[PDB]
Design a protein around this ligand. Sequence first.
Ligand SMILES: [Cu+2]
Length: 289
Amino acid sequence: KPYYDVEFNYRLDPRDGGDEVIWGGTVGLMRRKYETRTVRINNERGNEHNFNLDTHGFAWVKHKTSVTEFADYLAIRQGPYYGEVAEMLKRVTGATKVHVIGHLHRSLNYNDTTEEEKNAPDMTMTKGQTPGRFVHVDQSYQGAVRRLYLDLPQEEARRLEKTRWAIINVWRPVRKVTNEPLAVCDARSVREDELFNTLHLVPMRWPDAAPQENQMWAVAPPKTPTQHKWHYVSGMTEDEALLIKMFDSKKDGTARRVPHSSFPTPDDFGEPRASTETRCFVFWEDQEA
Ligand SMILES: [Cu+2]
């Protein structure tokens, strides 16, 4: 199939009853009201090579992992996965340094979890993670700088900030994707004025810790199905990776931030999609910030 036309969840402005906060990981977020717009998502299977991190802000690569068990967070963190991703991402970006910080495992079906969690209070967390079915970038420009100075030692962050740096997510499915694929939006098809600084809060270890804080970009709805240039690749497997630029310090033409969203298709079948996304800092220490 060459494309789908599907409903996407975009920003509801507070003056029309929109919330200020994304309560990431919670049952409530699945009941959040949005500005829904139908958008066209173009299938790029057979045409991956025409997308790259500099122009569009994303790239599909051939890359195998020796890891098949993503359920144990600590086991992922202590194994070879992070080093695998770092070596690959260093080679694709021509970077001088790559720091792999963390990952998120996704394995819950959105529809099934909606049905399962009907009696769950809003701020209760799901038993694992749903697909990210809303249009966002993981870090704002401010969010990107917060993440640098919290995930790196302060002295390194001060130094590396002086040279070009980016945040890139590496998205890999556990097995062939036959439901709820991930869509990525051409960085150039969204304008600065459509981007809105939005608190993302995750109530981990409530009540012993304050929710984990991030500053993401929410996105204003388009006026047309094709104004935002949406893209996915069908049947993506564990032998493939999607690199998504959340942030780049470069202020020339270079793609700086990619709105992404999961979406259901009418052809969805099989076991719930599962994926991991690993958040990486990329450094070119031989380049102006
Ligand atoms: Cu995301």
